[PDB]
Structures are given as C-alpha cells and as structure tokens.
Amino acid sequence: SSQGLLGYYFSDLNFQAPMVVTSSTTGDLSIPSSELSENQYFQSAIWSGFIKVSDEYTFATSADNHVTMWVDDQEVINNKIRLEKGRLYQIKIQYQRENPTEKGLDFKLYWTDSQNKKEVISSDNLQLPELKQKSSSRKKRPTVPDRDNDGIPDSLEVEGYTVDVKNKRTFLSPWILTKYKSSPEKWSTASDPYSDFEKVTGRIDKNVSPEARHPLVAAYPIVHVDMENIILSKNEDQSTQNTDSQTRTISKNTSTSRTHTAGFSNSNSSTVAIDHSLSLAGERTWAETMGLNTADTARLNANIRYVNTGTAPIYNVLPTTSLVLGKNQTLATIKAKENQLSQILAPNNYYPSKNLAPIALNAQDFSSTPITMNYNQFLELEKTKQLRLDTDQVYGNIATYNFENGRVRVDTGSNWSEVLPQIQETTARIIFNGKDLNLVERRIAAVNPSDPLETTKPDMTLKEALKIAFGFNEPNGNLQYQGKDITEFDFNFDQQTSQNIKNQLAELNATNIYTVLDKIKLNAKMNILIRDKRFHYDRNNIAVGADESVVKEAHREVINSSTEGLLLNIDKDIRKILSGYIVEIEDTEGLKEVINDRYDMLNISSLRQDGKTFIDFKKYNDKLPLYISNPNYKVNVYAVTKENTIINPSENGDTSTNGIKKILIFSKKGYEI
Ligand SMILES: [Ca+2]
Ligand SMILES: [Ca+2]
C-alpha cells in the first residue's frame, strides 16, 4: 500500500514542471481529475521502480504511441521478453502527449503471459525505486533531476512543496497545508537517518515524533534517567556475624529533572533531589538512624525509568549511565543488557512504560553490583541530598524504511552513533521549557554559511523553527505556545550565537527580537534556550522560584478557609517551584506562633483529584485544627520556594524554620475564617 511504481506527472511536455509525485500500487497509474486547475493538464510523465515475477511476457500500455518503456536499459516499448522468478528488473516508463483535452491522466500498464491472459499488473509484482544513498539486488537508476536520490525533484525541494493525502496515497506537489522546503543535495536535510521523502510520505517508523516528519526537524533519541525513590541501608560486613537485626533503612521519595548547563554539550544528564521532609520518628542523623559507625559502609537502591524526550525511538541498546555523588564521585554504572529490551523506548515515553513496574537498580538478580558509599560519602549525601545521572549517547540500531518491501524494520547496518555527530554539526538547537517547566531539546536544519552543502538548505527563521519544532502557532497576529504568547518566554544564547543574533538585529535596525522573529535566521551550531519568564532558574536551568508578586497573585483565589486549612486553585507551574508552606498564628501584639515550625514539616499541601490544592493546618498540629484564642488574631500562611528551602539542620543543630525566606500568601483574622 506504500508500495508500487513512483510516478512524476508534469504540466509541460519535457519533464521540467512536476505537478504531482505519487506512487501507484498496481499497473493502474491513473490520476483522475477528482484527485486534483490550469495545471491539471499533464503533458508528460515518468514512472520508475522494479518488477518481480518465470515466463515470456509482453508489456503494453494504454498509450503505446506516446510511450517509451525500458526493462533494465532494454527498450520494450517505443516483443516478448523473458522474465525469471526470484529476480528484480528495473522499470522506467516515459509518456509525452501535447495538448491533452482532459484533465488528470488515465494511464494503465499491462502485461500478457504465455496463456494470453492480459491484465493490469498486480500490486504483488511492482516495487518502488531504491531511493537510498546506496544500492542494496536493487540499484539506483530521461532523468528527473534528483541530485540526492530521495525521490523529491530538485526544483520542488528548492521552491517549496506540499503533501496531501488523496484516498490512499500521498500527492507531493508544488506550493502555490504545511509548506515544505528541503535541500536537493541532502537525502536527509536534518542529517538524520530518514529521507526527506520518507518523512513527508509516511514511509517511516510510526514512533518518530510528529514534528520530526518535517524534513527540517531532526529525528533522534534523547534519553535521561528518572529516579523515583531511594532506600539507604547499612552494608553487611565480615565482622558482624548476625543478620537478624531490625529494619533500619532510610526510604525517601526523589524528584529528577533533565538538566541543561546556553551551552554546547550534547551530553545527557539529570539531577536528583532526595526529599528532606519527615519520614521517620525522632530527629536523628542518618548514621544514628541506620546505626552506621565511622568504619561502616552504606548502600543505595532506587527505582528508575528511562525517559525519551527526543524525536526518534530506541530499540536494542539503552545508553549507559553513571550515578555520581558531588562533582565526580561515581557510585555506580547502570547498564541494561543489549538486544534484550522488553519494549521500544519511544519519544515522549518511558522504559518501562508507566503502566509497568519501574526498574530497581538492584533487582530482586544475583549479579547486581551494590551501590556503596563510605562513611564520609554517606554524610555528604545526607548534606547535599543530591545525586546526578550522566547518560551516554549510545542508542544502537535504527528502524529504517525498506523500499523493496515497504516495511520499517530494525536494520543491523544502521546505527545512531553514525548519525548523531552530523545532526549536531548541521542544526540549530533550541531548548524550551514551556511543557511543564521541563527542558525539551529540538534541533532544526539551519544553514552553515561556511559549509557549501549546508548552504543548499532553506533559510530557517527563529519564528518558523518555533512553529515546526515546538508547535507554536499564530492565530491572531501573535506567535503563541498553547495559549501563551512568545513574549512570556525569554531568549538566552551561547556566546557565539549571541553575537550572531546581535549583529543580525543591528543589520535589521531592530531593537526588539520579539517583533522580528520572522527575520532572524538560524545557523548550524547555534544554541538557544527559551524559558518561561515567571520563574527563577538554577545553574541547571531547573525552575526553583519566582518573584513575590507572581507567587502572591497565584494564591489570590481562595475557595475556602477554616481552622483546618486552605482550599485554593493554584496553577500547576507555580506548584512545581514550592517545597511547602508555613502556617503561623499572629496575636494582637504581633508575636507569632509558627505551627509547623520545622524544616522537614513544610510538606502540608496536596493536590486533590479535582485539581484544587488543600493546605493542611492539622497535619503538623497533632491532628488538631488551629486554636485561635481571640478572633482578632491572624492566621498567616507562607509559601517557601525551592531556592529558599532549608534541607538540613543549621550548623548549630536548629531544625526550626527560623530565618527561612518565605512569602506571605494568605492573611486573615479569626473572624474572617
Ligand atoms: Ca531530491
Ligand atoms: Ca533532499
């Protein structure tokens, strides 16, 4: 159904002005007018492909007077020819007719066998041309200019084309739907493993991201590891003979973010934050809790998933990951067995899938290496409550389209490691956080003025890149991402990119980038980082806070209040930058009673299934509503942002909230509750 002969239909008599490129599954090579105005008249056509059958055959068409046909460079129409089973023969057909009186083309290709049965050639017999960068049994190729052999004529790639689905196939036509342009000299304009033609005609792995079906958007995996929770325990040692002692482990939830530190690194990394909120009774040190003496060792287990935030899937190799304490203390290497993956790792997805159990670093597996820390490393983890996961870019084999059989299959001859460098060298990179404040990278084909091949690509503007790579749209004068104007996001660039864009702005006599996005041209190797302006970002470009005015405004909508808590509607992005809340009762003279007065007791908010947030005053008040002794006392509630969050007791041991920088978000007298 994606298989057959490939046809080019031209409005002129001499194969210069292709109006339609499309394939036919059978010898019926017609395009009726209903699938198509002054240029619906076709004066020439070329069809290309292969035939596979053992007999003497006679070829004929419905217009033999206007046709030349070759079977492997032997002219068969301008004859019984012998064809053998199990063999592939090249087919080329040319058709020319001056001043046709009907629109479209009625054209059929027949053959007659030695029992004199004549019929339109069936689908089982016809195959597409080998539109690849190398020949396979099937070579590549009255020549349509097609310098890169992807199947799209030079002129269309340069001038602009559209693809439309008509019944059961794709018509590729000149632009007068999405307007495509691509390099006529790059089989894959994004330097990825899928051709410009494969992409736009759907002859491609169904798991490739929708946006990466544009020839100007790169299709490649981007993988990091998400750690969901951790369990720490004292290692057994040769000196301790008895193993029957009580459970003394520390179990914590963890939050992991993919990071970016703009920059030039194509490295994968994620940073893990270990929850500091109360989980065990007492206020013990981690050593005290687990009974670690100064000569003991501890180990760590965790649950993880791999995340693919890129645009193409992985099939047979997961990348290797280092788990790192502090700057460079590697605690573990995490690997998966090659060629034994339980599933695909698709774009915008996880491995294992979220409907399945995550992976335990030490699986309930005789050979799993313990993830051990010495005593000083353990104390460092307790202090920092951070780990890092550095993942390589080793992604294995690629599922490619095969023109012989019209199937996509993992090709042991094709490997992501042969493609990534060229993608990185020839594209502009944009990292955007508009999807839930998580950093998502895309790469867009962009000219490199210094590399002659890369100058054969279309100009990529900043506006178009944002539209095609991230789905920005323009409904009514103004570029937007899911309702949010582009002006709600900032632009940051690496040093070279910044100078380039500065010089462009100067050349345009433009002082504001947001009003000339359609005029700013991207170049290969640019790095652009675009972040939601509402937020404060750490050195990893993780959102960790927001200005007080933003935070206050975000808590203005109170549904209900009582001595039990607050019920509010709070934007999802704002919730992401808080560690918790502090509740206080303020008496008439201005003295304050802090109710949950501990750095590990701020986790009092929860998101209900109706999407509203409840801030629970009872949780750390011994399960009791607030006692307000005089109705003129105030109940004050403060938000604590991540960047302001205390994760350890103070140097002198104080576990209270004294001196924590907090933002007042609710204040009402007792009689107002
Ligand atoms: Ca081409
Ligand atoms: Ca091309």
XYZ file of C-alpha atoms and ligand atoms in Angstrom:
675
model
C 0.000 0.000 0.000
C 3.022 2.330 0.399
C 4.458 0.128 -2.383
C 4.324 0.270 -6.230
C 5.870 2.391 -9.004
C 6.805 6.036 -8.326
C 5.262 8.476 -10.758
C 6.134 12.018 -11.730
C 3.396 13.925 -13.601
C 4.382 17.141 -15.361
C 2.302 20.040 -16.737
C 4.884 20.630 -19.529
C 5.843 18.303 -22.390
C 9.542 17.918 -21.408
C 9.650 16.714 -17.752
C 10.549 20.171 -16.214
C 7.437 21.154 -14.195
C 6.319 18.326 -11.907
C 2.826 18.893 -10.553
C 2.385 15.556 -8.744
C 4.778 12.970 -7.327
C 2.948 9.872 -6.071
C 3.033 6.096 -6.167
C 0.583 3.591 -7.555
C 0.167 0.150 -6.027
C -0.925 -1.530 -9.321
C -0.284 -1.002 -13.060
C -3.175 1.467 -12.963
C -1.052 4.619 -12.942
C -4.025 6.983 -13.362
C -4.708 10.216 -11.508
C -8.343 11.124 -12.132
C -9.292 14.815 -12.131
C -11.315 14.287 -8.901
C -7.985 13.865 -7.027
C -6.823 17.255 -8.352
C -6.670 23.832 -12.375
C -4.954 25.263 -15.440
C -2.145 22.824 -14.420
C -4.331 19.694 -14.094
C -3.358 19.025 -17.745
C -0.422 16.566 -17.835
C 1.744 16.598 -20.973
C 4.421 14.239 -19.696
C 5.130 11.618 -17.044
C 7.876 9.276 -15.829
C 7.392 6.153 -13.737
C 10.267 4.276 -12.036
C 10.607 1.106 -9.928
C 11.120 -2.630 -10.216
C 9.123 -5.671 -11.258
C 9.404 -9.134 -9.680
C 7.651 -12.233 -11.025
C 9.094 -17.460 -14.890
C 7.688 -16.804 -18.382
C 7.794 -14.766 -21.596
C 5.875 -11.527 -21.133
C 4.569 -8.829 -23.447
C 4.313 -5.331 -21.954
C 1.769 -2.786 -23.197
C 0.256 0.478 -22.007
C -2.904 2.379 -22.771
C -0.923 4.875 -24.911
C 1.874 2.947 -26.663
C 2.097 5.651 -29.370
C 3.245 8.132 -26.656
C 5.398 5.837 -24.550
C 8.922 4.557 -24.278
C 9.459 1.764 -21.702
C 12.699 0.139 -20.581
C 13.188 -3.109 -18.635
C 16.813 -2.931 -17.308
C 18.018 -0.478 -20.023
C 16.393 -2.616 -22.806
C 13.671 -0.760 -24.713
C 10.497 -2.900 -24.585
C 8.054 -0.281 -25.993
C 8.730 2.591 -28.420
C 8.483 -8.007 -28.295
C 8.093 -10.905 -25.890
C 10.746 -10.539 -23.091
C 11.743 -13.410 -20.779
C 11.441 -12.753 -17.030
C 12.735 -15.169 -14.340
C 11.137 -15.769 -10.894
C 13.012 -14.517 -7.814
C 14.701 -11.738 -9.796
C 14.127 -7.960 -9.816
C 14.078 -5.949 -13.063
C 14.274 -2.160 -13.259
C 11.353 -0.397 -14.853
C 11.383 3.040 -16.438
C 8.412 4.459 -18.398
C 8.166 7.837 -20.150
C 4.990 9.344 -21.574
C 4.577 12.535 -23.623
C 1.375 13.999 -25.148
C 0.971 17.586 -26.427
C -2.312 19.411 -25.576
C -4.386 16.778 -23.810
C -8.103 17.527 -23.873
C -8.822 16.086 -20.455
C -7.507 16.828 -17.016
C -5.509 14.306 -14.981
C -4.180 11.163 -16.600
C -5.856 7.836 -17.473
C -2.877 5.506 -17.944
C -2.539 1.775 -17.332
C 0.333 -0.658 -17.643
C -0.472 -4.212 -18.685
C 1.235 -7.461 -19.382
C 0.260 -10.618 -21.211
C 1.703 -14.032 -20.219
C 2.027 -17.178 -22.371
C -1.584 -18.322 -21.638
C -2.606 -14.965 -23.305
C -4.099 -13.639 -20.053
C -3.701 -9.818 -20.294
C -4.163 -7.754 -17.166
C -3.205 -4.580 -15.397
C -0.026 -5.509 -13.477
C -0.950 -6.531 -9.944
C 0.484 -4.965 -6.784
C 2.370 -8.111 -5.797
C 4.600 -7.526 -8.846
C 5.668 -3.877 -8.508
C 8.181 -2.222 -6.184
C 9.354 1.294 -5.608
C 12.726 2.532 -6.761
C 15.639 2.287 -4.308
C 15.558 5.865 -3.057
C 18.509 5.470 -0.695
C 22.079 6.751 -0.509
C 23.409 3.305 -1.521
C 22.242 0.412 -3.704
C 21.256 -2.847 -1.987
C 19.701 -6.609 -5.616
C 18.251 -3.140 -6.275
C 20.364 -0.407 -7.948
C 19.518 3.279 -8.208
C 18.670 4.208 -11.813
C 15.184 10.577 -19.171
C 16.280 11.559 -15.651
C 14.204 13.625 -13.207
C 16.762 15.897 -11.515
C 17.071 14.389 -8.076
C 20.661 15.006 -7.024
C 20.299 13.302 -3.596
C 18.157 10.320 -4.693
C 15.453 10.848 -2.057
C 12.770 10.938 -4.773
C 11.741 14.586 -4.496
C 12.776 16.528 -7.610
C 15.409 19.237 -7.094
C 13.019 22.055 -8.108
C 10.299 21.126 -5.630
C 12.712 20.832 -2.670
C 14.091 24.316 -3.516
C 10.865 26.121 -4.450
C 8.525 24.613 -1.886
C 6.155 21.665 -1.825
C 3.056 20.322 -0.084
C 1.846 16.788 0.646
C -1.827 15.937 0.646
C -3.468 12.549 1.217
C -5.846 11.608 -1.643
C -7.854 8.380 -0.937
C -4.992 6.023 -0.152
C -1.809 7.827 -1.156
C 0.160 10.990 -0.792
C 0.487 13.561 -3.553
C 3.538 15.679 -3.349
C 3.004 18.928 -5.298
C 4.492 22.390 -5.696
C 3.387 25.095 -3.267
C 1.215 27.880 -4.728
C -1.346 22.594 4.470
C 2.336 22.767 5.549
C 4.795 24.427 3.127
C 7.870 22.226 2.962
C 11.329 23.114 1.647
C 14.407 20.917 1.882
C 17.911 20.588 0.415
C 18.028 18.985 -3.090
C 21.529 17.699 -2.189
C 20.798 16.193 1.268
C 18.922 12.904 1.233
C 18.011 13.818 4.875
C 18.109 17.593 5.182
C 18.386 17.275 9.024
C 21.280 14.771 8.528
C 19.177 12.117 10.314
C 18.511 8.527 9.155
C 15.123 9.170 7.442
C 14.909 10.752 3.970
C 13.060 13.945 3.176
C 10.683 11.862 1.031
C 10.273 9.073 3.622
C 9.286 11.656 6.203
C 6.655 13.558 4.230
C 5.083 10.403 2.659
C 4.873 8.407 5.898
C 7.400 5.793 4.784
C 8.827 5.989 8.292
C 8.839 4.406 11.733
C 5.433 5.276 13.266
C 7.212 6.063 16.535
C 9.079 9.062 15.104
C 7.589 12.245 16.637
C 5.037 14.135 14.557
C 7.209 17.261 14.331
C 10.172 15.170 13.073
C 8.159 14.214 9.959
C 9.225 17.718 8.707
C 12.425 17.477 6.663
C 13.792 20.472 8.612
C 13.324 18.948 12.092
C 15.799 16.282 13.256
C 14.574 12.845 14.343
C 16.852 11.416 17.022
C 16.582 9.936 20.572
C 17.352 11.982 23.713
C 17.471 9.816 26.846
C 17.898 10.509 30.563
C 17.161 8.568 33.716
C 14.381 9.487 36.127
C 14.912 8.282 39.703
C 11.564 7.931 41.581
C 12.701 6.888 45.064
C 15.702 5.657 47.043
C 16.377 3.301 50.005
C 19.611 3.513 52.001
C 20.953 0.774 54.191
C 23.928 -0.285 56.206
C 26.075 -2.813 54.407
C 26.687 -6.191 55.990
C 30.335 -6.665 56.944
C 32.522 -9.680 57.642
C 32.905 -8.596 61.288
C 29.133 -8.695 62.071
C 28.127 -12.367 62.132
C 24.444 -11.814 62.986
C 21.964 -10.794 60.322
C 18.662 -10.971 62.303
C 18.551 -7.340 63.480
C 15.562 -4.979 62.907
C 14.958 -2.981 59.698
C 17.000 0.221 59.922
C 16.719 1.590 56.353
C 16.018 5.137 55.157
C 13.470 5.341 52.354
C 12.826 8.682 50.556
C 10.980 9.910 47.507
C 13.072 11.636 44.861
C 12.435 14.164 42.125
C 14.570 14.096 38.998
C 14.935 16.673 36.237
C 16.786 16.572 32.933
C 19.275 19.469 33.013
C 20.988 21.924 30.653
C 24.097 23.803 31.892
C 23.029 28.298 26.608
C 25.863 25.674 26.391
C 27.421 23.453 23.657
C 27.140 19.969 25.286
C 25.199 17.099 23.689
C 25.587 15.078 26.823
C 22.587 13.649 28.668
C 22.258 14.435 32.383
C 19.679 14.608 35.124
C 19.808 15.831 38.694
C 18.044 14.031 41.531
C 16.702 15.766 44.674
C 16.175 13.497 47.664
C 13.154 14.555 49.770
C 14.033 16.265 53.069
C 10.567 16.044 54.545
C 9.836 13.988 57.659
C 9.617 10.200 57.137
C 10.924 8.504 60.318
C 10.231 9.158 64.051
C 12.828 11.259 66.008
C 15.170 13.913 64.541
C 18.121 11.551 64.199
C 21.102 11.892 61.882
C 21.120 9.341 59.029
C 24.010 7.497 60.769
C 22.108 7.330 64.036
C 19.036 6.093 62.153
C 20.873 3.265 60.393
C 23.445 2.573 63.159
C 26.410 3.459 60.937
C 29.661 3.757 62.761
C 32.551 5.632 61.308
C 34.115 2.465 59.768
C 30.836 1.185 58.219
C 29.610 1.421 54.651
C 26.137 2.077 53.275
C 24.409 1.182 50.065
C 21.669 2.573 47.978
C 18.868 1.034 45.945
C 16.446 3.020 43.838
C 13.661 2.745 41.339
C 14.268 4.307 37.921
C 12.857 4.691 34.420
C 14.492 5.819 31.200
C 12.856 8.796 29.535
C 12.947 9.622 25.808
C 12.346 13.323 25.311
C 13.692 13.286 21.741
C 12.060 12.634 18.405
C 13.032 9.081 17.479
C 12.824 5.748 19.238
C 15.383 3.297 20.589
C 15.114 -0.447 20.037
C 18.149 -2.521 21.039
C 20.596 -0.674 23.272
C 19.879 1.515 26.284
C 22.596 4.060 26.929
C 24.966 3.518 29.903
C 24.536 5.790 32.965
C 26.882 6.905 35.744
C 25.358 7.667 39.133
C 27.522 10.445 40.667
C 27.827 11.936 44.171
C 29.068 15.517 44.371
C 31.050 16.735 41.401
C 32.782 13.490 40.308
C 32.449 10.568 42.759
C 30.958 7.801 40.650
C 28.935 5.441 42.822
C 27.581 3.104 40.138
C 27.399 2.338 36.470
C 23.851 1.442 35.335
C 23.516 -0.763 32.319
C 20.804 -2.762 30.521
C 21.573 -5.974 28.606
C 21.910 -5.190 24.851
C 19.493 -6.723 22.355
C 17.210 -7.850 25.219
C 14.986 -4.779 25.708
C 11.459 -5.587 26.995
C 9.953 -2.897 24.720
C 10.695 0.045 22.471
C 11.705 3.314 24.188
C 9.569 5.685 22.160
C 9.636 9.502 22.084
C 7.558 11.137 24.847
C 7.638 7.902 26.712
C 9.376 5.818 29.402
C 11.101 2.453 29.758
C 9.494 0.572 31.428
C 6.216 2.123 30.396
C 4.327 3.857 33.190
C 1.713 1.041 33.359
C 4.503 -1.328 34.389
C 6.849 -1.518 37.406
C 9.927 0.666 37.277
C 13.460 -0.773 37.254
C 15.189 -1.406 40.610
C 18.911 -0.685 40.461
C 19.449 -3.953 42.356
C 16.609 -6.141 41.118
C 15.155 -8.867 43.285
C 19.281 -10.704 40.060
C 22.270 -12.395 41.713
C 24.813 -10.304 39.893
C 23.691 -6.761 40.613
C 26.597 -4.683 41.939
C 25.957 -2.980 45.293
C 25.918 0.781 45.155
C 28.135 1.507 48.123
C 29.272 4.658 49.915
C 31.861 5.014 52.567
C 31.001 6.840 55.784
C 32.194 10.290 54.590
C 30.308 9.871 51.264
C 27.166 8.953 53.218
C 27.442 12.154 55.267
C 27.997 14.106 52.041
C 24.779 12.602 50.595
C 22.853 13.449 53.784
C 24.080 17.080 53.491
C 23.567 17.624 49.780
C 20.519 15.361 49.208
C 21.514 15.336 45.585
C 22.718 12.811 43.038
C 23.464 13.140 39.307
C 22.785 10.692 36.469
C 25.088 11.103 33.459
C 23.876 9.081 30.472
C 25.828 8.478 27.257
C 24.540 8.829 23.726
C 24.890 5.153 22.814
C 21.496 4.237 21.317
C 22.134 1.270 18.982
C 20.416 0.353 15.702
C 17.807 2.237 13.701
C 14.485 1.060 12.204
C 14.571 2.280 8.614
C 12.207 2.008 5.648
C 12.996 -0.643 3.031
C 11.825 0.173 -0.489
C 11.892 -3.492 -1.602
C 9.043 -4.441 0.736
C 7.585 -1.224 2.061
C 8.228 -2.183 5.686
C 10.073 -0.492 8.539
C 12.450 -2.819 10.390
C 15.488 -2.524 12.679
C 18.462 -2.505 10.331
C 21.594 -4.026 11.935
C 23.599 -1.996 9.362
C 22.349 1.386 10.636
C 23.417 2.882 13.983
C 22.596 6.123 15.797
C 26.261 6.667 16.510
C 26.847 7.241 12.760
C 24.178 9.914 12.624
C 24.271 11.993 15.808
C 27.506 13.868 15.086
C 26.199 15.111 11.712
C 22.844 16.092 13.235
C 24.700 18.069 15.894
C 27.008 19.752 13.356
C 24.276 20.848 10.921
C 21.367 22.013 13.095
C 20.435 24.795 15.438
C 19.472 23.643 18.875
C 16.567 25.065 20.806
C 15.876 24.058 24.392
C 12.376 25.093 25.538
C 10.645 24.636 28.891
C 7.043 25.534 28.056
C 5.902 21.908 28.637
C 5.546 21.811 32.417
C 8.854 23.668 33.005
C 10.804 20.655 31.871
C 13.677 21.218 29.442
C 12.966 19.726 25.944
C 15.554 19.932 23.183
C 14.870 20.060 19.448
C 17.239 20.536 16.525
C 16.327 22.278 13.311
C 18.204 22.154 9.981
C 19.918 25.554 9.592
C 22.413 26.893 7.088
C 26.080 26.981 7.858
C 27.359 29.832 5.685
C 30.889 28.371 5.764
C 29.937 24.818 4.523
C 28.874 24.804 0.874
C 26.478 21.761 1.141
C 24.735 23.292 4.150
C 24.079 26.498 2.101
C 21.782 24.404 -0.138
C 19.197 24.234 2.698
C 16.389 26.710 3.013
C 16.667 29.678 5.287
C 15.386 28.789 8.733
C 13.962 31.685 10.745
C 13.515 31.728 14.511
C 9.751 32.029 14.083
C 9.465 29.036 11.737
C 11.747 26.941 13.937
C 9.462 27.537 16.911
C 6.382 26.665 14.816
C 7.731 23.443 13.300
C 9.792 22.139 16.215
C 7.585 23.048 19.206
C 4.163 23.668 17.687
C 3.950 27.399 18.311
C 1.087 28.833 16.275
C -0.194 32.249 15.210
C -3.964 32.567 15.440
C -4.322 36.343 15.591
C -1.214 38.438 14.973
C 0.968 36.883 17.716
C 3.139 33.756 17.991
C 1.883 31.509 20.898
C 2.599 28.176 22.598
C -0.572 26.621 23.872
C -2.125 29.963 24.602
C 0.977 31.661 25.959
C 2.490 34.482 23.866
C 6.125 34.133 22.864
C 6.783 37.326 24.957
C 6.074 35.268 28.105
C 9.378 33.408 27.421
C 12.957 34.701 27.487
C 15.742 34.088 24.990
C 19.250 33.091 26.034
C 22.076 32.190 23.756
C 25.636 30.863 23.922
C 28.374 33.434 23.290
C 28.799 32.839 19.536
C 25.042 32.649 18.982
C 24.500 35.816 20.971
C 26.957 37.775 18.851
C 25.477 36.416 15.667
C 21.922 37.439 16.684
C 23.138 40.824 17.951
C 24.702 41.518 14.536
C 21.551 40.400 12.741
C 19.438 42.744 14.868
C 21.841 45.605 14.075
C 21.640 44.774 10.344
C 17.805 44.877 10.580
C 17.936 48.136 12.595
C 15.735 46.234 15.086
C 15.971 46.815 18.805
C 13.479 44.120 19.939
C 13.862 40.500 18.939
C 10.190 39.631 19.605
C 8.936 41.890 16.771
C 11.315 40.405 14.103
C 11.289 36.643 14.783
C 10.374 36.085 11.115
C 13.589 37.959 10.106
C 16.154 36.336 12.434
C 17.912 33.494 10.661
C 19.180 30.469 12.480
C 22.561 28.920 11.615
C 24.010 25.480 12.293
C 25.554 25.054 15.738
C 23.501 27.825 17.354
C 22.246 27.113 20.868
C 19.118 28.867 22.056
C 17.472 28.458 25.422
C 13.871 29.647 25.920
C 12.342 29.728 29.375
C 9.071 30.807 30.983
C 9.733 34.329 32.407
C 7.616 33.778 35.540
C 10.384 31.736 37.146
C 13.852 31.788 38.689
C 16.293 29.144 37.425
C 19.296 27.418 38.905
C 22.562 26.723 37.105
C 20.981 23.529 35.680
C 18.075 25.567 34.266
C 15.641 23.933 36.655
C 12.847 26.249 37.871
C 13.393 26.882 41.573
C 11.402 30.023 42.402
C 9.551 33.137 41.304
C 9.258 36.737 42.356
C 6.970 37.530 45.299
C 4.407 39.386 43.177
C 3.966 36.277 40.937
C 3.679 33.944 43.939
C 1.161 36.146 45.799
C -1.018 36.642 42.704
C -1.002 32.834 42.159
C -2.605 32.256 45.602
C -5.279 35.002 45.364
C -8.172 32.617 44.501
C -9.296 31.104 47.817
C -12.184 28.655 47.564
C -12.475 28.004 51.275
C -10.613 28.688 54.523
C -11.061 27.316 58.046
C -9.128 26.366 61.159
C -8.451 23.072 59.281
C -6.772 24.561 56.189
C -6.979 26.413 52.891
C -8.574 25.260 49.681
C -7.182 27.174 46.636
C -6.807 26.805 42.896
C -3.100 27.132 42.062
C -1.544 26.986 38.577
C 0.425 23.727 38.027
C 3.673 25.516 37.134
C 3.623 27.577 40.341
C 3.148 24.421 42.441
C 6.318 22.984 40.877
C 8.613 25.679 42.416
C 7.409 25.273 46.033
C 8.726 22.921 48.707
C 5.853 23.664 51.090
C 4.129 26.162 53.301
C 4.491 27.623 56.791
C 1.403 28.257 58.998
C 1.524 30.890 61.749
C -0.902 32.427 64.253
C -0.199 36.105 64.954
C -1.519 37.544 68.192
C -2.776 41.046 68.780
C 0.688 42.403 69.908
C 2.477 40.999 66.800
C 4.011 37.871 68.272
C 3.858 34.837 66.038
C 3.218 31.140 66.844
C 4.605 29.025 63.964
C 2.520 25.876 63.899
C 4.687 23.590 61.698
C 7.979 25.006 62.861
C 10.425 22.545 61.374
C 12.376 22.499 58.076
C 11.082 18.931 57.422
C 7.444 19.705 58.267
C 6.576 22.041 55.373
C 5.035 19.375 53.140
C 1.445 20.272 54.036
C -0.065 20.819 50.559
C -1.671 18.171 48.375
C -3.384 18.210 45.025
C -6.881 16.823 45.128
C -8.412 14.842 42.313
C -10.497 17.936 41.444
C -7.247 19.907 40.764
C -7.638 22.173 43.783
C -4.800 22.427 46.369
C -5.515 21.862 50.077
C -3.012 23.322 52.583
C -3.456 21.127 55.703
C -3.110 23.007 59.010
C -3.845 19.814 61.014
C -1.014 17.660 59.643
C 1.743 19.011 61.934
C -0.573 20.351 64.688
C -1.052 16.924 66.355
C -4.048 16.339 64.030
C -5.960 19.262 65.580
C -7.488 22.312 63.920
C -5.838 25.656 64.752
C -6.858 27.063 68.117
C -7.484 30.792 67.690
C -7.964 32.325 71.182
C -9.139 35.796 70.163
C -10.957 36.479 66.847
C -8.584 39.425 66.137
C -5.596 37.019 65.940
C -4.424 36.395 62.391
C -3.764 33.176 60.525
C -0.839 33.753 58.152
C 0.286 31.193 55.527
C 3.570 31.488 53.656
C 4.925 29.753 50.574
C 8.554 28.515 50.568
C 10.128 28.267 47.123
C 12.740 25.602 46.261
C 15.624 28.082 46.113
C 14.741 29.242 49.664
C 14.239 25.740 51.044
C 16.297 24.504 54.014
C 17.293 20.846 53.575
C 19.374 20.298 56.740
C 19.501 21.492 60.282
C 21.551 24.698 60.782
C 25.243 24.400 61.743
C 24.236 24.632 65.458
C 21.520 21.923 65.078
C 18.389 24.141 64.898
C 15.706 22.269 62.969
C 13.150 25.141 63.165
C 12.016 27.450 60.368
C 13.881 30.436 61.947
C 15.179 32.712 59.199
C 13.690 30.793 56.245
C 12.844 33.229 53.485
C 9.091 32.787 52.969
C 6.347 34.561 51.019
C 3.080 35.611 52.667
C 0.226 34.254 50.557
C -2.745 34.347 52.957
C -3.556 36.528 55.988
C -6.956 36.692 57.672
C -8.236 37.417 61.143
C -10.031 34.633 63.028
C -13.457 36.244 62.466
C -12.732 36.233 58.658
C -12.127 32.434 58.587
Ca 15.689 15.131 -4.059
Ca 16.598 16.236 -0.051
